[PDB]
């Protein structure tokens, strides 16, 4: 099951729901008046997060959920110095 995360500039991002939920903020937004039907597709809209930031955020969710040191590949999540402050704001907001 997936959820749709839309950026400020109209970009939709579809990620596994359990992955997207590593964020408390998102869980909160999908509750209360943000609650969704039982079989309706979940969709959240961020108004202050651009696509080049929100896409990286989604990458983080996967990076996290599949984190493993016992692999033939040693985990790593490099961030471009030109999108960190904008990503720091996004992470402080999503809380993760």
């Amino acid at each position: 099951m997936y959820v749709k995360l839309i950026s400020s500039d109209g970009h939709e991002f579809i990620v596994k729901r359990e992955h997207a939920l590593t964020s408390g903020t998102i869980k909160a937004m999908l509750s209360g008046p943000g609650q969704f039907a039982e079989n309706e597709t979940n969709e959240v809209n961020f108004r202050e997060i651009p696509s080049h930031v929100l896409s990286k955020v989604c990458m983080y969710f996967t990076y996290k959920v599949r984190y493993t040191n016992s692999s033939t590949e040693i985990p790593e999540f490099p961030i471009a110095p030109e999108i960190p402050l904008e990503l720091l704001m996004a992470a402080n907001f999503l809380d993760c």
């Binding site: 983080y60 040191n69 961030i79 110095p81 704001m89």
Partner: protein, 163 residues
């Protein structure tokens, strides 16, 4: 600075922030340390408990001859690498065990076997916020001159190391 109670403080503290990095692997056995690093690249290390009474932390790192283990000694209120290791650096004594690891990681990453300290093995996926921090601390050391909220600048102040 050299004092019985002052050294116990400096330690207890530097040992506190150590568990705030993610490279502390608790009571990881030696074989397990070998498993993790066995195939890792030269310079990949991690910190764990020493089954010895004179020192508290051990550094497991991958070298030319494979994974190795070596102390992190504390005396006269300063943290230094193992005695055995022939060290050639402008600085050999630090206050925080984390300050030590950082300095060397910057130098090394940038007499038989060679010894490097480059990539620490994180016990679990760090927070995105922290990775951003680590990323920013690598770019500059002048935080406040940035276009960030006065509070996030505070978050970047609670950890100044590049790893």
């Amino acid at each position: 600075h050299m004092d019985p109670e002052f050294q116990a403080a400096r330690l207890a503290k530097a040992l506190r922030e150590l568990g705030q990095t993610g490279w502390y692997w608790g009571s990881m056995t030696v074989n397990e340390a070998k498993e993790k690093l066995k195939e890792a690249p030269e310079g990949t290390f991690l910190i764990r408990d020493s089954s010895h009474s004179d020192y508290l932390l051990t550094i497991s790192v991958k070298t030319s001859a494979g994974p190795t283990n070596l102390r992190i000694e504390y005396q006269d209120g300063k943290f230094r690498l193992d005695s055995i290791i022939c060290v050639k650096s402008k600085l050999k004594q630090f206050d925080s065990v984390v300050h030590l690891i950082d300095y060397y990681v910057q130098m090394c990453k940038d007499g038989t076997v060679h010894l490097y300290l480059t990539k620490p093995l994180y016990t679990s996926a760090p927070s995105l916020q922290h990775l951003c921090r680590l990323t920013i601390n690598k770019c500059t050391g002048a935080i406040w001159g940035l276009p960030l909220p006065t509070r996030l600048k505070d978050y970047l102040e609670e950890y100044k190391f590049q790893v």
